[PDB]
Structure formats: C-alpha cells, structure tokens
Amino acid sequence: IIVVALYDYEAIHHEDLSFQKGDQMVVLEESGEWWKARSLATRKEGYIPSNYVARV
Amino acid sequence: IIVVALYDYEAIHHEDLSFQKGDQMVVLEESGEWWKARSLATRKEGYIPSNYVARVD
Amino acid sequence: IIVVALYDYEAIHHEDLSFQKGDQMVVLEESGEWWKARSLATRKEGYIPSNYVARVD
Amino acid sequence: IIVVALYDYEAIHHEDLSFQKGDQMVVLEESGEWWKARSLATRKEGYIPSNYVARV
Amino acid sequence: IIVVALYDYEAIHHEDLSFQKGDQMVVLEESGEWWKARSLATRKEGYIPSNYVARV
C-alpha cells in the first residue's frame, strides 16, 4: 500500500524518515501508530507517524 | 500545571502552538492527544501534541 | 524517577553530566544538591545539579 | 467522511464525545448506532449518537 | 494550580518567598493563610501570603 504525506515531517528519532507534503511512500510495515516506509522520491527509508499520511 | 517540551514542534494547523525542545508552558486543558497551552517562552496560546511534552514539578 | 532538564549544563568536572534543556534522564541517586543520573539518550552517567532539572510528575 | 451535528449532545459515558449543534467532526468508525468521531471544533474523540449528525 | 502576584512582597521570615506584582507561581500546598509556592522564573520555593495572589 502506498500513502501520501498530508504534512511535512522532520525526523525526530534516528530511525525516522523525513518527508514533505505530497511525497509518496511505500509502507513496509504497519507496526502501530508508527509505520516503516520507503520514500518513492528520495529512496531513503524509516519510520513515519501514521497520522501524517493518507492511504491512496 | 506546567509542561516542558521534549522535542521541537512547528505548528501545522492554525490554532497550533509552535515550541522548541526545553520550552516551558502552562497547560490550560488536558484534552487527550491535544492539550491547550500557554507558552512561557513566546506568550502565545494554542494546541500542542501531548506526546511531545512531559508534565513536571 | 525520571527528570527533564530545564536548562543547558556544561560539565565543570569529570564525574558530572553535560545535558541540554529538554533532555530526559533517570535519577539514580538523590544525594543533596547533586544527583547521579543517566541520560536516556546517550546512556551516559554522572552527577547533575538538582536545580537544573524537574521531576516528571 | 465528515458529519455536522444537528443537536447539542452531552456525553452520558466517559468514552462519549460531547458536542454542540453545528459542530463538524470526522467519522473514524461507523459501528452501528454509535460512531467513533474526532471533533473538528475541540479535536477530542469519542462516541456520538449517529442520529444526532448528518453526513456531508 | 498557578497563581499571579497582585502586589510586591518582601520576605519577612526565612521560610517565606519574596515576589513582585505580576509574578506567576505554582501553588505547591494550600496550607491555609500561607501557601507553599514555587516561582516559575526563579524556581525558588517558599511560603507566600495567599491574600497577595490570585488563582488563575
């Protein structure tokens, strides 16, 4: 499942992923409130807050 | 009734309160995931993600 | 038993800890004006001035 | 996905979500007679009586 | 709860706190005519005459 970022996000932790509004990412794991994902744009990966994204 | 910011937070919504790690604020309402607060650093008011702060003594 | 730093502190000795405002640490010993603690971020241990931190309550 | 409140509602339980007439809220879950919602006005969450709101 | 000083006060005992009109403090204990409090700016603790402050 691919999701789109609704808002910009600054990585707080180290295992965190930095994305911007509009970015598309592939959800690798739906761990809980925090999901593992890979950016389709930058190619980098990490955890993202699930409340900042929407399922396409 | 005061909290200290554990991380930086830039307001996303319009009534959101921006704050920097270390900032002290007075909690106005403890309403779940979002709390209403008064900043002692900037003097502004707004909502804050409760998981970004720690209630202290 | 955890506290959060209210201000930045530069270690003046070898046995005490350096921390920045907003940092969280575990208090190992509450012995006087100086407390032994462990930074939750770096795991580092040392003494901290008790007046620079506030207990999470 | 969003509904507008037709009447004022006082929570009868601790999990309920109180609101006023006209308030807009996002419906999180449509579990029958009681729906889980997030208020756009107060940002709070809880269950609301589904016959008290209208879907837009 | 937090209070704000209505008037300037000069400490008389060794236990009471000195504060200025407008200062905000956190009430630690509401021990009658003399409440224990903590200045928010100086973090210093001590007793204050309750009739000199207004609870917000």
Next chain:
Amino acid sequence: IIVVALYDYEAIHHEDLSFQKGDQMVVLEESGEWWKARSLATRKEGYIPSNYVARVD
C-alpha cells in the same frame, strides 16, 4: 468576570487602556480577540488584548 494581567501593555489606539502586569480589571465584553475592560486600579475603561490577561478562578 475579573481578569489579571500577565504582561505589561501600552495603549496604541485611543480607546484601549494601558495596564501593568499584576493589574486587575473587570471584563465588560468578551468580544472575540479583544475584550472590553474597566481597570480596578486606574478606574479607566477600554479594550485589552485577551491573550495578555488571565481569568480569575
């Protein structure tokens, strides 16, 4: 309801009243962002920024 000033304020317009932090004033109108108030100290009347004052409990 009566309010207490959290910060100092200096009147820019001609209808709003200046007040020092600590000043008590009666809220005449809670007209949005700018409340109408009468100062219990200066006895004057005028508008005040609502975010500069706190409500008495």
